Amino acid sequence: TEGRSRDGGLRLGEMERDCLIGYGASMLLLERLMISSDAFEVDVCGQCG
């Protein structure tokens, strides 16, 4: 969620993404943006795609 009235969670904006790209750290922004935001598991059919 977004606010402080509700419990929050700070934002990794569109500029921090470019900073982390600039550092060249490839696993750290993966951990920041998928592992600890909305890592979800699905199932896909390869026959139909």
């Binding site: 569109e14 470019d18 900073c19 790209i21 600039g22 550092y23 060249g24």
Partner: protein
């Protein structure tokens, strides 16, 4: 009236700062979106996301802008030579003359490891060594010093002292600094340009 004119002039800066929040941010957004994919490969090339060649060698030299000591050059030969002279005084060894300096420099640089270095860098080192070897000659001539080292007021040998150990140390330091100042493979060489122009 002065108070009113002063406030009138002042508010322009506030308005300018308020406006500035948009244009530079948008320009940096576009630029970083455009330049994001470029990377430095193991062939010393830089290639796009599809393997297309953008450059055959990064920036011509292949050197890292952040490791530059001089004005866009990796060294200032005078500064390194002075540091090596100061930290490694040679109280026992004899001062070199022009011919001996040239001979020993040529002998040291002849080794294979220096041939592995970049050619233009060797040209620069030769130029600087020739320059200092020419400078020492004027000083030795003006005071009438003998290269045999037998002059009686020995303080005259303090004017432009340089000894083989100092030459070796200077050359090794120059080469080492040059080798470690390169742009490493894998570098995000595209985003750095975008940030460095946008900021």
């Amino acid at each position: 009236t002065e108070f009113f004119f002063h406030t009138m002039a002042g508010r322009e800066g506030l308005v300018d700062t308020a406006v500035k929040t948009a244009e530079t941010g948008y320009m940096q957004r576009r630029l970083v979106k455009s330049l994001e994919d470029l990377c430095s490969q193991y062939d010393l090339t830089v290639r796009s996301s599809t393997g297309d060649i953008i450059q055959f060698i990064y920036g011509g030299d292949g050197l890292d802008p952040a490791a530059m000591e001089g004005k866009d050059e990796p060294l200032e030969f005078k500064r390194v030579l002075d540091n090596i002279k100061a930290v490694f005084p040679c109280p026992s060894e004899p001062a070199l003359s022009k011919n001996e300096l040239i001979l020993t420099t040529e002998s040291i640089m002849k080794k294979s490891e220096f041939l592995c270095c970049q050619d233009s860098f060797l040209q620069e080192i030769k130029k600087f060594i020739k320059g200092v070897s020419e400078k020492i000659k004027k000083t030795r001539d003006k005071y009438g010093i003998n290269d045999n080292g037998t002059t009686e007021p020995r303080v005259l040998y303090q004017l432009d002292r340089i000894t083989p150990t100092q030459v070796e140390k200077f050359l090794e330091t120059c080469r080492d600094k040059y080798m470690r100042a390169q742009m490493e493979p894998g570098s995000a060489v595209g985003a750095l340009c975008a940030q460095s122009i946008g900021e």
